[PDB]
Amino acid sequence: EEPRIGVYVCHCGVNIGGTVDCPDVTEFAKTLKNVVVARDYKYMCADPGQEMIKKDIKEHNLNRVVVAACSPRLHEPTFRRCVAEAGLNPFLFEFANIREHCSWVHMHEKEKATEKAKDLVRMAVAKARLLEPLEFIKVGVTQRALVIGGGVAGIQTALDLGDMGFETILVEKTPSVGGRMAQLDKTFPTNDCSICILAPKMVDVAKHPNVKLYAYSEVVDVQGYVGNFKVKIMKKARYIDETKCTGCGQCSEVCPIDVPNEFDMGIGMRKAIYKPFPQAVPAKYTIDKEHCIECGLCAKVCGPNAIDFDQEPEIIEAEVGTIICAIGYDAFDPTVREEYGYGVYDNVVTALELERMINASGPTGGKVIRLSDGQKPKRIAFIQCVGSRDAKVGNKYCSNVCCMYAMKNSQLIKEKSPDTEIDIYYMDIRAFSKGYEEFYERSAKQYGIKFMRGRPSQVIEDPETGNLVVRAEDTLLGEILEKEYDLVVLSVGMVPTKSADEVQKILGISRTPDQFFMEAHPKLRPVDTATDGVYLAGACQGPKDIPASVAQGSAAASRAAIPLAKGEVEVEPIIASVDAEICGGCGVCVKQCPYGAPRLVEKDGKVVAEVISALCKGCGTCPAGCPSGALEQDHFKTIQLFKQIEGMFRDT
């Protein structure tokens, strides 16, 4: 049948129309072969736009639709549903990106943007002509979810999913769940005890009938696609019998190797054999082989003889339908900001270190003290925006929680020591949510915490006393201050967790300019990722506080429960297949597929290749590498791409 194309040019208000002469693109579109209808409209995704496309498909008997608008990554599915509702196969629809790829990047070159939009429409029309109707692959959904990361976000997702009756697996890297919230002393704006409100949830998750918690474990491989993921979990060896482990802690005294306690941010000192924190769930010990010397002194003291160095990590194979990534974040390392002297001056600390110092169960026994002499500081300075809103360190974003935790900890220090003078050096106080501005008002009126508007230039240590001097301009007075302090606290920003690189490669997700994981759309889909069946929850998606993280955990559980509840999802048939009449079995394609989909086989007495459709993810590498042309990826066939290339220069 002959192509009958409908070209729709969107103005997107003035986002496109303001730069691209949309009516002119529409007139040009009509001059192309097979383009029987062409219209321009203010909002193509809106109800009148979709109804326009639909009505035209029926009235003008179109078999190809071209939408010249935003990015397919945003609305390709929207328009596929719109055309499918009118009876047109969704793979006979072609998107032409003239907004993100044209109007938004060529704002001061309108005539050239208009010319570029015409070529992109022509390139789309060129591919559209040779597109073919494909059947969306209906696949089943394994009734099981996987949550990676055991913090407040991941815990919330697994609790909601388990409460809905869905089998859920929760994988936690460290020996205990709880995340950074377990390291905090109290939480703003209520000043609630962090662990005192988090432990009940850690307990609920550990004994939930629908949640399988795998602590001290890591996801090492994820294969498959939405509804059919095959996941490999490595249950790391603690080198201590899990069942015979009482969790008393008497084998650590003998250990001669001291390791800096990660939980205490490097202030505290733990042993090779240890426990992360007192309220840890599950309550069990672990041997760190990265620092263990295998002297066996701990084994001589250990009664049960739970210690076993011949313990081997177990690889667990599990099948899940959806995956929620909630690996959280790490605190920025301020050593780079050399003028603040972190790592040089003893009394300059990060706010996360301060949290561990304030926390009752911390290394200093809940006592805020100077690391140089052990004395309690009488004067303290908080420096805001450390590692945030700073191009020199590559973090041009706001870490969201630093203004609030700085004011919070200042209140906690005042409650414990009212005579302590506290000054906060800031640019903007961001107390933007419920009770936050009130919390800010309170810090000053009730606790007498002082605020200086001015980002400090440098910190200088007095080598005689260990005291620090903060150099900064009081911008509200137009004068330079040089105030002395007993302790300087750096309000460090949030950065992606160290393992984020590994987790990205395993799930196949992307990152935003801030290096955190990328959501499908900031407003249309805040917890979904462009990768179907993979969602996000918490700080790994971007800097945010506890409630925002808990809300995302719940949101991710809802989004992740949709495929599980439906029990069936539709996946793209943009897969590779071998033309047996052309394949002479050269074997080049076999090793190119990382999923082993193409395989050599005997057919009609000779050897040919055959793609196992289910294992093909649709990359297009093997057809590109096929020297006979027998292999072709549906929707990205060489001929289709060839016509698309011709389209940039001429009509074909």
- By CB under 6 A, residue 356 contacts ligand FAD: no
Q: How far apart are CA 546 and CA 405, in angstroms?
A: 12
Angle at which helix 152-163 crosses helix 194-206, to 10 degrees, equals: 40
- By CB under 6 A, residue 583 contacts ligand SF4: yes
64, 99, 212, 408: which one contacts ligand SF4 (CB under 6 A)? 99
Looking at beta carbons only, is 61 or 446 nearer to its own copies?
446
Q: How far apart are CA 348 and CA 338, in angstroms?
A: 12
**Is residue 363 within 8 Å of residue 268, measured between CB atoms?**
yes
- By CB under 6 A, residue 406 contacts ligand FAD: no
- By CB under 6 A, residue 255 contacts ligand SF4: yes
Give burial (CB, 10 Å; 0-12/13-18/19+) of 103.
buried
- By CB under 6 A, residue 530 contacts ligand SF4: no
- By CB under 6 A, residue 562 contacts ligand SF4: no
Looking at beta carbons only, is 248 or 565 nearer to ligand SF4?
248
| Binding partner of 546, given Fe ion, ligand SF4, ligand FAD, none, CB within 5-8 angstroms per partner class | ligand FAD
Of residues 316 through 355, those in contact with ligand SF4 by CB under 6 A are none
**Is residue 455 within 8 Å of residue 392, measured between CB atoms?**
no
Q: How far apart are CA 583 and CA 630, in angstroms?
A: 5
- By CB under 6 A, residue 407 contacts ligand SF4: no
63, 504, 593, 640: which one contacts ligand SF4 (CB under 6 A)? 593
Tokens of 229: 């993921």
| Binding partner of 36, given ligand SF4, its own copies, ligand FAD, none, CB within 5-8 angstroms per partner class | none
- By CB under 6 A, residue 595 contacts ligand SF4: yes
Looking at beta carbons only, is 432 or 649 nearer to ligand FAD?
432
- By CB under 6 A, residue 188 contacts ligand FAD: yes
Looking at beta carbons only, is 220 or 283 nearer to its own copies?
283
- By CB under 6 A, residue 251 contacts ligand SF4: yes
**Is residue 117 within 8 Å of residue 17, measured between CB atoms?**
no
Footprint of Fe ion on this chain (CB under 5 A)? 45, 196
Q: Which residue is nearest to ligand SF4 (CB)?
A: 402
Distance of CA 163 to the CA centre of its chain: 24
Looking at beta carbons only, is 31 or 512 nearer to its own copies?
512
Of 2-10, 147-155, 222-230, 458-466, which segment contacts ligand FAD by CB under 6 A?
147-155
**In which region does residue 178 sit, left (phi positive, over 0), alpha (psi from -120 to 50) or beta (all else)?**
left
- By CB under 6 A, residue 491 contacts ligand SF4: yes
Looking at beta carbons only, is 467 or 552 nearer to ligand FAD?
552
Cross-strand bridge partners of residue 234: 218, 315
Q: How far apart are CA 579 and CA 6, in angstroms?
A: 32
Of 264-272, 292-300, 314-322, 542-550, which segment contacts ligand FAD by CB under 6 A?
542-550
Give the neighbor-by-neighbor strand order of the sheet with 314-320: 217-225, 228-235, 314-320
Residues contacting residue 230 through CB under 8 Å, at least 6 positions apart: 222, 223, 224, 317, 318, 319
- By CB under 6 A, residue 334 contacts ligand FAD: no
Of residues 360 through 389, those in contact with ligand FAD by CB under 6 A are none
Of residues 34 through 53, those in contact with ligand FAD by CB under 6 A are none
Q: How far apart are CA 469 and CA 503, in angstroms?
A: 42
| Binding partner of 538, given Fe ion, ligand FAD, ligand SF4, none, CB within 5-8 angstroms per partner class | ligand FAD
| Binding partner of 328, given its own copies, Fe ion, ligand FAD, none, CB within 5-8 angstroms per partner class | ligand FAD
Q: How far apart are CA 92 and CA 262, in angstroms?
A: 55
| Binding partner of 326, given ligand FAD, Fe ion, its own copies, none, CB within 5-8 angstroms per partner class | ligand FAD
**Is residue 69 within 8 Å of residue 12, measured between CB atoms?**
yes
- By CB under 6 A, residue 184 contacts ligand SF4: no
**Is residue 324 within 8 Å of residue 148, measured between CB atoms?**
yes
Helix, strand, or coil (residue 350)? strand
| Binding partner of 129, given ligand SF4, Fe ion, ligand FAD, none, CB within 5-8 angstroms per partner class | none
Minimum distance from CB of 166 to ligand SF4 (Å)? 28
Q: How far apart are CA 217 and CA 174, in angstroms?
A: 7
- By CB under 6 A, residue 449 contacts ligand SF4: no
Of 95, 49, 52, 106, the closest CA to residue 70 belongs to: 95
Of 45-53, 168-176, 313-321, 578-586, which segment contacts ligand FAD by CB under 6 A?
168-176
Looking at beta carbons only, is 83 or 413 nearer to ligand FAD?
413
Minimum distance from CB of 27 to ligand FAD (Å)? 34
Minimum distance from CB of 628 to its own copies (Å)? 41
CA gyration radius, the chain: 30
| Binding partner of 366, given ligand SF4, its own copies, Fe ion, none, CB within 5-8 angstroms per partner class | its own copies
Of 114, 54, 113, the closest CA to residue 79 belongs to: 54
Angle at which helix 22-30 crosses helix 110-129, to 10 degrees, equals: 40
**Is residue 198 within 8 Å of residue 154, measured between CB atoms?**
no
**Is residue 183 within 8 Å of residue 195, measured between CB atoms?**
no
The 189-228 site mask, x for binding ligand SF4 (CB under 6 A), equals ----x-xx--------------------------------
End-to-end CA distance of the chain: 17
Q: Which residue is nearest to Fe ion (CB)?
A: 45
Binding positions for ligand FAD, rule: CB under 6 A: 148-154, 171-174, 179-181, 184, 187-188, 218, 326-329, 331, 351-352, 355, 401, 405, 408, 497, 499, 503, 538-539, 544-547, 549
